[PDB]
Amino acid sequence: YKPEVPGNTVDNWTELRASWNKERASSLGTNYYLNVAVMGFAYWLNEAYYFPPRTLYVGALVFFALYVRKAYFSTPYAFKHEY
């Protein structure tokens, strides 16, 4: 016995193709912007190490809850001709 793949093959393969019909950007922009963000604004966290631990833990959970994943990322703005 083997389980059946759910769905239709044409519809599943169109789902697999979606949002990838675009040339991928080079990674130099992401890396340069990350380095600029760290070298310019990471000193804002110097006093944060002394803040109460409930605040630090809730802030860490908030950063995890609002994080957007870089892999498999897509925007509807990539395929529209006006804002």
Structure token pair of residue 52? 């109460």
Site string for ligand CDL, 29-68 (x = CB under 6 A): -x--xx-xx---xx-xx-----------x--xx-xx--x-
Asked if 72 and 24 count as a contact pair (C-beta separation under 8 A), the reply is: no
Q: Alpha carbon of 61 to those of 23, 33, 37, 52: distances in Å?
A: 34, 24, 21, 15
Structure token pair of residue 82? 């006006």
Q: Residue 1: name its binding partner from other proteins, ligand CDL, none (Cβ under 5 to 8 Å by kind).
A: other proteins
Q: Residue 27: name its binding partner from other proteins, ligand CDL, none (Cβ under 5 to 8 Å by kind).
A: other proteins
Site for ligand CDL in 64-83 (CB under 6 A): 64, 67, 69-71
